Amino acid sequence: QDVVLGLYYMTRDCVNAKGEGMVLTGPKEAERLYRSGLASLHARVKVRIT
Amino acid sequence: GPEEITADIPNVGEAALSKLDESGIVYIGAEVTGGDILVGKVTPKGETQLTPEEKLLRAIFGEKASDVKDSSLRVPNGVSGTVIDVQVFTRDGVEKDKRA
Amino acid sequence: KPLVGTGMERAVAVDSGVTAVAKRGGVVQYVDASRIVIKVNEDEMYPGEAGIDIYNLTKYTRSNQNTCINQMPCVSLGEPVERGDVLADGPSTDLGELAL
Amino acid sequence: MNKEILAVVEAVSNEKALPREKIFEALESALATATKKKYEQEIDVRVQIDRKSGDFDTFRRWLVVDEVTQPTKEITLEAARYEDESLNLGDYVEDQIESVTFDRITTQTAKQVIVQKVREAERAMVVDQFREHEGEIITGVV
Amino acid sequence: ATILAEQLEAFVDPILLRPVDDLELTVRSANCLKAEAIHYIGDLVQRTEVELLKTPNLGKKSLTEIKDVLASRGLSLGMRLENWPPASIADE
Amino acid sequence: EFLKPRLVDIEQVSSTHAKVTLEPLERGFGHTLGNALRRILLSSMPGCAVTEVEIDGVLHEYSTKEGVQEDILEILLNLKGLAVRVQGKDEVILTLNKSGIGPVTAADITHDGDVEIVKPQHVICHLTDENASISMRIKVQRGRGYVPASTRERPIGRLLVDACYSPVERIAYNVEAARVEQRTDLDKLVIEMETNGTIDPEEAIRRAATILAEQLEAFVFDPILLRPVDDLELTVRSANCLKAEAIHYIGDLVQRTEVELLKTPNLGKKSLTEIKDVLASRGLSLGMRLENWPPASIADE
Amino acid sequence: VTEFLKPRLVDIEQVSSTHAKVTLEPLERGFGHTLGNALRRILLSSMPGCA
Amino acid sequence: GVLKIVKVYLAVKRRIQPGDKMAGRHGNKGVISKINPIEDMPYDENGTPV
Numbered sequence A: 001q002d003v004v005l006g007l008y009y010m011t012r013d014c015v016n017a018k019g020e021g022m023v024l025t026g027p028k029e030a031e032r033l034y035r036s037g038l039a040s041l042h043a044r045v046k047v048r049i050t
Numbered sequence B: 001g002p003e004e005i006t007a008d009i010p011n012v013g014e015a016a017l018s019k020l021d022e023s024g025i026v027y028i029g030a031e032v033t034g035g036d037i038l039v040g041k042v043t044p045k046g047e048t049q050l051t052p053e054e055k056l057l058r059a060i061f062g063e064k065a066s067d068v069k070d071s072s073l074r075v076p077n078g079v080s081g082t083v084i085d086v087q088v089f090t091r092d093g094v095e096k097d098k099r100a
Numbered sequence C: 001k002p003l004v005g006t007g008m009e010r011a012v013a014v015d016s017g018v019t020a021v022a023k024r025g026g027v028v029q030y031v032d033a034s035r036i037v038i039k040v041n042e043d044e045m046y047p048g049e050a051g052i053d054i055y056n057l058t059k060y061t062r063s064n065q066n067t068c069i070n071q072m073p074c075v076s077l078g079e080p081v082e083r084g085d086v087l088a089d090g091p092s093t094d095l096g097e098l099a100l
Numbered sequence D: 001m002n003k004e005i006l007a008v009v010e011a012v013s014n015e016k017a018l019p020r021e022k023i024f025e026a027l028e029s030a031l032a033t034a035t036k037k038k039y040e041q042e043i044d045v046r047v048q049i050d051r052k053s054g055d056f057d058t059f060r061r062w063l064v065v066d067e068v069t070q071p072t073k074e075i076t077l078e079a080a081r082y083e084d085e086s087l088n089l090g091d092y093v094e095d096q097i098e099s100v101t102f103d104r105i106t107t108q109t110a111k112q113v114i115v116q117k118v119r120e121a122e123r124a125m126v127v128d129q130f131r132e133h134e135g136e137i138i139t140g141v142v
Numbered sequence E: 001a002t003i004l005a006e007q008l009e010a011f012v013d014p015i016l017l018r019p020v021d022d023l024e025l026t027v028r029s030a031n032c033l034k035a036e037a038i039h040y041i042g043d044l045v046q047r048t049e050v051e052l053l054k055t056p057n058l059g060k061k062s063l064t065e066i067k068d069v070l071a072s073r074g075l076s077l078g079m080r081l082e083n084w085p086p087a088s089i090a091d092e
Numbered sequence F: 001e002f003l004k005p006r007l008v009d010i011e012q013v014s015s016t017h018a019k020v021t022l023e024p025l026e027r028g029f030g031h032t033l034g035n036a037l038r039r040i041l042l043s044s045m046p047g048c049a050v051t052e053v054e055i056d057g058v059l060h061e062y063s064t065k066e067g068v069q070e071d072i073l074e075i076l077l078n079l080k081g082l083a084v085r086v087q088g089k090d091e092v093i094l095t096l097n098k099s100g101i102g103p104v105t106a107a108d109i110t111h112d113g114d115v116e117i118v119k120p121q122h123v124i125c126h127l128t129d130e131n132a133s134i135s136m137r138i139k140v141q142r143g144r145g146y147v148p149a150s151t152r153e154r155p156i157g158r159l160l161v162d163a164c165y166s167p168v169e170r171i172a173y174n175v176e177a178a179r180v181e182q183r184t185d186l187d188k189l190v191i192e193m194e195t196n197g198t199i200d201p202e203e204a205i206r207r208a209a210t211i212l213a214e215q216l217e218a219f220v221f222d223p224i225l226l227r228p229v230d231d232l233e234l235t236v237r238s239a240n241c242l243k244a245e246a247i248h249y250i251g252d253l254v255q256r257t258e259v260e261l262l263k264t265p266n267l268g269k270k271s272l273t274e275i276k277d278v279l280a281s282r283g284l285s286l287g288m289r290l291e292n293w294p295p296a297s298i299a300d301e
Numbered sequence G: 001v002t003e004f005l006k007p008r009l010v011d012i013e014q015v016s017s018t019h020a021k022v023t024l025e026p027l028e029r030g031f032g033h034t035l036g037n038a039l040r041r042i043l044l045s046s047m048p049g050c051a
Numbered sequence H: 001g002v003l004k005i006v007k008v009y010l011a012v013k014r015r016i017q018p019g020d021k022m023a024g025r026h027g028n029k030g031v032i033s034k035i036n037p038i039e040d041m042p043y044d045e046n047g048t049p050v
Helices: A002-010 A027-036 C010-014 D005-009 D020-032 D108-133 E002-006 E025-033 E041-046 E049-053 E060-070 F029-043 F070-079 F201-218 F236-243 F250-255 F258-262 F269-279 G031-045
Strands: B038-039 B081-090 C026-031 C033-042 C054-056 F019-026 F050-055 F089-099 F102-105 F125-129 F132-139 F144-149 F163-165 F173-179 F185-191 H004-009
Touching: A027 G031, B038 H004, C010 F070, C054 F250, D108 F173, E002 F201, E025 E060, E049 E060, E060 F132, F019 F029, F019 F201, F029 F173, F029 G031, F050 F070, F070 F125, F125 F132, F132 F236, F201 F250, F201 G031, F236 F269, F258 F269
Parallel strands: none
Antiparallel strands: B081 H004, C026 C033, C033 C054, F019 F185, F050 F132, F089 F132, F102 F125, F144 F163, F173 F185
């Protein structure tokens, strides 16, 4: 119950947030942009995943 | 014979009756632990007779009944506390001890 | 106390028997953790049996569920009290309300 | 006075020539002794030895002196002024008592300690026996 | 750790002087000494125990209380003062 | 070249709580030092609370005393909330005597030469008769954190209260923008604490910074003993000094103390200097104790 | 009253030279979070470097 | 056949610990699961911890 709420709030999206439509060189700097305070947890973004 | 609920008994330690008074019953106010002695109580066991081996040990005490044992009340294992109130009820005819 | 009650706390507290409800109103004379003395007003008072009431509170004693049924005095000294009014709060009460 | 100890006084297989009275004193402390770490400091070996009694109730002492040692037993000339100067200097006046442990029904009060005291008495007796000779040309077996 | 540490280098006898009534014993033990116009235990230490035992103002239980107080050896140790003051007890 | 924080203004706006101020700070360090010093100040600061109470005519803490309208338990709670400063001691014993109708305030304690009550209007209990008097001894000591009664009394007359050795109540930092000094993107850290009067605020921020900088201090068989005494690089006299006590291995020299060797005149003055030169390598004479010969690595196979 | 438990890093269990896993023990109750948060914000927010 | 009855009243003081049961007045039960320190609590922009 708690963990599906944490995931459903995490992997979602909104039509404008901090860092809308910026491009990221990996998931590591995705978490670094979430922690430093430069993007939001749900902000649509092109990443490069492997 | 009847039982004895005076001070200690045998098989005791400074830790066996260091919180009891001179008549077995714990004080009012003694903060005890789990497994101390609150009321010291000794009962009888074997009657037998007069053994030749311990002739000076079975006569000096003056125990012509004897072989008493150990059945003292203890705090049940786990609970602390502070003894706040002690009641002593005596069936009539029986000698009141000093704390009663 | 309950910050968000229903106003039904005073009926459950007073109409039970854990608080020390005043029988005849008057002026308090002596408050103590043991007893409470009410001096009865003259417009409530018998001609004979001169009369100042003594409430002996019930201090620390055992309930059935091994809780601690206490009564604490909640009135000051020299304080007026009316007929039908709390003097000593009980267990889980406060000023005559019901604080679980 | 149940005359319980009286008959036990003259047991007397190996405690005939030995200090009978002293043995009873040790036995009393073993019963009242053993597990006795309360009171004030310890127990009380010394006790009013009353042959007729048999069970000499553990009596304490005050030991009149003139110094400030051994707190329990401390008397002075200024402290003996309340008793109309009846106490002297260097007197072992007793002014306190103690307690024992039931009777013979409580075996181990003096049983392990009772035997312990008996053991101490036996050691003293053996010392006296070896002092009787005080070194001689005797043999032995390993 | 070097940065965070460099951001913090701009920050980084009493028993005799006390009254007889202040003793842990009961008021009777203090009043026994106070009957001879004594208010401080230093005055009790100035006088000998034999001199106090030669006066019936002290009682038998008061003697035991005096012994219990002298067991700590802070008072009634047979001392002699100038009147009140030791050198450590100086006026400032 | 980071700008360093320096305390600038200590606004003692009331008697309990104050607002210390740190300036300047580069961006990011505001929340870092704010959360860090908040968590140190709430965690572990030296307070001066109370531990033991001995009311005179009271056996256990659940009793009642004749002539006081609160229980002994409520007196223990009201003494648990006592706000007191001590100055030059570990623990201290305060004495209370009061007789007469009315309250027993916290200013009725016979104060010593260093104990200082910081709130003298604090009520303890209410005496309620003409001859009914309390007379208690209070034990107040230093500490850190929350030390309850269940973890840590010998007579039956002592009463143990819980010990909340904690002077502060509420620490709130509010970062905000900084003016001139001719550079923007600088921050000010304004910390409003909430003391109970027992701790000076600059002393609190100084002890918190000292504790945190102490935490960052973390990163900001002997072959000589098994060998014979004669195998040492020193002369034969240095070996013979130890060998005069029937010693053949240096492990036997390490088994005995240097004080025990100095208490024997078999060793000489130059032999003491040679022993010091040998012990400078710290392989022998280090004050050790063996079983007899063998360590675990020195095992028989 | 001031002398806490003072730690030292017990191991640096490292994978290849640009990655590591550094432990710290024992710390006083509640100080793991304040040192982790202080070092995390300092490393992740303000370090000197070139890019 | 009884000589004397001795009754002794122990008075335990049980505080709180992880494992007790607390509940409101609406059916929201619960075993209290962790007794946190003061600092870890979510506080607001006044200073008071919840």
